[PDB]
Amino acid sequence: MRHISPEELIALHDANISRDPGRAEAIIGRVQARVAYEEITDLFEVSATYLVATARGYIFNDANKRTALNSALLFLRRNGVQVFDSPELADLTVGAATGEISVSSVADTLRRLYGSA
Amino acid sequence: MRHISPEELIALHDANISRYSDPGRAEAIIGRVQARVAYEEITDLFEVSATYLVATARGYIFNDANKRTALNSALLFLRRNGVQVFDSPELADLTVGAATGEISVSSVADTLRRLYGS
């Protein structure tokens, strides 16, 4: 099968902007990795792997992630909970945005960090 | 419980947009959260906080460049490999649902196989 390159992906994106690289390098590598390692052989399953990987990495961008994180932290602040930055929070947001980490696991992580005895 | 107001949410969004938006978006997000908390009987600050996180990410998903790129890549790869491709109504809801994990990979593949396959 014929794959798409990072340079081709960056170029799809520039063209769409008119309404990295970095991110694109990582997406294609992620995609090519899963296809090899998990023996994904049919075209539509591979196509679907591209949509999912590309959707996740472009749609849940930095601005989206930080707004989402901030709204969660703001809500806790407003309810008298002390919050602080913790290195866990970056991965926690994309995980939760994408459906990898269920809402209950996020709540448990947040409770562990900021929560009472 | 004190909830976030639309104004604070728009301001978080604009600050983040200005760094690296239409008011009703923010109301929808806040309403999706208030429903889940009054429905599912949620008293735990942390579960409400986690709901905000997921509901604000899912967003805030715009019909923009980032959404289109994802779809271009899936469709370019099919074209590259001998599959004829065309615009269909299923595809917009396919991307968002793919991104959010609501639609599984295999279901995504199934929808493309049914539209484009022999």
What chain B residue is nearest to A62 in terms of C-alpha separation? B20
Q: Which of B56, B58, B76 to mutate to test the interface with A (most CBs of A within 10 A)?
A: B56
Identity of the residue in A4, A63, A79 whose CB atom sits nearest the CB atom of B73? A4
Q: Is A5 helix (H, G, I), strand (E, B) or coil?
A: coil
How far is A30 from A50, CA to CA, in rounded Å?
9
Q: Is A63 helix (H, G, I), strand (E, B) or coil?
A: helix
Q: Is A84 helix (H, G, I), strand (E, B) or coil?
A: coil
Chain B residues whose beta carbon lies within 8 Å of the beta carbon of residue A30: none
HSE-CB for B16 with a 13 A CA cutoff: 22
CATH class of the region B21-62:
special
How far is A62 from A66, CA to CA, in rounded Å?
6
Count of other CB atoms within 10 angstroms of residue A27: 24
Look up residue B72 and give its two tokens.
């271009």
Structure determination technique employed = X-ray
**Chain A contact for B48 (CB, 8 A cutoff):** yes
At how many Å resolution was this determined?
2.5
Q: Domain-by-domain residue ranges, chain B? A: 1-19+63-118, 21-62
Q: What is the three-state SS of chain B?
A: CCCCCHHHHHHHHHHHHHHCCCCHHHHHHHHHHHHHHHHCCCCCHHHHHHHHHHHHHHCCCCCCHHHHHHHHHHHHHHHHCCCCCCCCCCHHHHHHHHHHCCCCHHHHHHHHHHHHCC
Look up residue A39 and give its two tokens.
């023996």
Radius of gyration of chain B (CA): 18
How far is A3 from B58, CA to CA, in rounded Å?
29
Chain-centroid distance of CA B2 in Å reads 26
Identity of the residue in A19, A48, A108 whose CB atom sits nearest the CB atom of B64? A19
Q: Find out whether A9 and A24 touch, Cβ atoms under 8 Å.
A: yes
Sign of the torsion angle spanned by Cα atoms A100, B9, A59, B38 = positive
